[PDB]
């Protein structure tokens, strides 16, 4: 049963390509908040900047998305953000760097 | 005046064969002496199982019952014609004198 | 060697013949050479003084039998195998 | 044993056996009050006081409604807010059963006490 639970964690985590430490802390946060933890946890992971960039199609894969954000290719509401961990909130506009647009 | 000595390991093979030898010969000439059973010799053979042998006690034991039959024929070559023509059992060895 | 019991001597022509040779005359005359096959025989004092010829595989060799030699088996004086000793 | 505990034990068992009725010998006012609560709750049918010219007797009509019931000892006092802890210990099944508590207002179910904002002492449980 443990193996089952363990693998499931590993799977969900590996998709996001997030470390155990960060993965765990997010989990704890999701668990703290009101609302079903399972959904909320997914919501927070989905809120990662790198993920959103990935979701937008700016990047082919999540890893590539991470690199893009790291390189400063991505912007949030104008100011550029380098943190793949950055938490996008509703209403934020996530665009490609003007400079980077001709990459 | 020909004596037929039929011998065989298997009784049935002989009974069959000897019977033919009588019936055929019955026509060509005399009636024949009539198949006679004759006593059966029993052979006990102990032979080394392996060719090395040489006293090696590997000699397995085998016994062969050898059955016999007389049905002596006393009469002419036509009778002989009947024999050469038809043959059957391989189980039986025929001795014609 | 291994004596066993009764150091054997082939009666053969040899033992019987030997005593008779001594008896043949008063202790004196002995037949010159007595060819024998009995390589196996054990030398006995009677034999001493005589000259039995022993067979190699090949031939018969004259062996004067002495009192010192008594006990040695006949033959043993007659070597079968030729050693290979040649010039250099 | 104490009268209330005794009454609750008998009812519990007779209920278990499947008996239609039970007679509870000591018939204290407290017992009757306790019974009324169980009745309102649908745990038991009709019951009546029989005058023996002694303690009295209670004839209780068993419904087959009760899974189990008993006295809670000691009768712990409870605040208006304090009930939840007790429901966990006394009612093994969530969403089932009631706690019968005695308040200055009178004997009643915990649920009524709570609506009332009254604390009290816990007499028994039924589920």
């Amino acid at each position: 049963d443990y193996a089952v639970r363990l693998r499931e964690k590993q799977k969900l985590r590996r998709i996001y390509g997030i470390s155990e430490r960060q993965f765990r802390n997010l989990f704890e946060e999701a668990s703290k908040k009101k609302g079903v933890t399972g959904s909320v946890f997914l919501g927070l992971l989905e809120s990662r900047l790198d993920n959103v960039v990935y979701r937008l199609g700016f990047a082919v894969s999540r890893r590539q998305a991470r690199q893009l954000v790291r390189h400063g290719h991505i912007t949030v509401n104008g100011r550029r953000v380098d943190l793949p961990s950055y938490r996008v909130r509703p209403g934020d506009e996530i665009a490609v760097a003007e400079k980077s647009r001709n990459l | 005046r020909i004596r037929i000595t039929l011998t065989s390991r298997n009784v049935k093979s002989l009974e069959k064969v000897c019977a033919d030898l009588i019936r055929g010969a019955k026509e060509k000439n005399l009636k024949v002496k009539g198949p006679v059973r004759m006593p059966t010799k029993t052979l006990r053979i102990t032979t080394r199982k392996t060719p090395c042998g040489e006293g090696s006690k590997t000699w397995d034991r085998f016994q062969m019952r050898i059955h016999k039959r007389l049905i002596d024929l006393h009469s002419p070559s036509e009778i002989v014609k009947q024999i050469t023509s038809i043959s059957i059992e391989p189980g039986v060895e025929v001795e014609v004198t | 060697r291994r004596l066993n019991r009764g150091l054997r001597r082939k009666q053969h022509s040899l033992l019987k013949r030997l005593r008779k040779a001594k008896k043949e005359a008063p202790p004196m005359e002995k037949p010159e050479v007595v060819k024998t096959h009995l390589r196996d025989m054990i030398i006995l004092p009677e034999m001493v003084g005589s000259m039995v010829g022993v067979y190699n595989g090949k031939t018969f060799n004259q062996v004067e039998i002495k009192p010192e030699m008594i006990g040695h088996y006949l033959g043993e004086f007659s070597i079968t195998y030729k050693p290979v000793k040649h010039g250099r | 044993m104490n009268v209330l505990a005794d009454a609750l034990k008998s009812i519990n068992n007779a209920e278990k056996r499947g008996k239609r009725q039970v007679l509870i010998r000591p018939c204290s006012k407290v017992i009757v009050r306790f019974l009324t609560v169980m009745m309102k709750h649908g745990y038991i049918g009709e019951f009546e006081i029989i005058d023996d010219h002694r303690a009295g007797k209670i004839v209780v009509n068993l419904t087959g409604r009760l899974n189990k019931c008993g006295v809670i000892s000691p009768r712990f006092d409870v605040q208006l807010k304090d009930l939840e802890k007790w429901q966990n210990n006394l009612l093994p099944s969530r969403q089932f059963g009631f706690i019968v508590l005695t308040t200055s207002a009178g004997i009643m179910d915990h649920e009524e006490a709570r609506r009332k904002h009254t604390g009290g002492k816990i007499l028994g449980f039924f589920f």
Partner: protein, 148 residues
Amino acid sequence: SLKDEVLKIVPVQKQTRAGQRTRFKAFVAIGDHNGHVGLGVKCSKEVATAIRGAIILAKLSIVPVRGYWGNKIGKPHTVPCKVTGRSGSVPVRLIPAPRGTGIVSAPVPKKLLMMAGIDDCYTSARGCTATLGNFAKATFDAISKTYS
């Protein structure tokens, strides 16, 4: 259809003057995960034969567990109430729990509970004997007692 989980298989021996005679025991749980569960324990000279016999035996005994139904109490991945059953020296305690809890129990009650289709419960083995066989019987006995 039914899924079969192999709870455990043991080698079990029996000493005799002649020598030890081994046989095999297998515990098998079979369940729909729709509230249908079956436990079977069958022994045989051969392991496979035992396991097969076990599954067949399990299907033979099924208990209705849990369900989502309208205008009634739903029992969504959990059990209607808390119960404790003592079989032999072994007690077993089952308590209902909210979603997300998972099945917290040792093996034995877990395997039974999972095949039961129960997703969230808090359990506790207790009493004198840890004995899995006795514990399993107790869990089964407990599951039976439950009513909605």
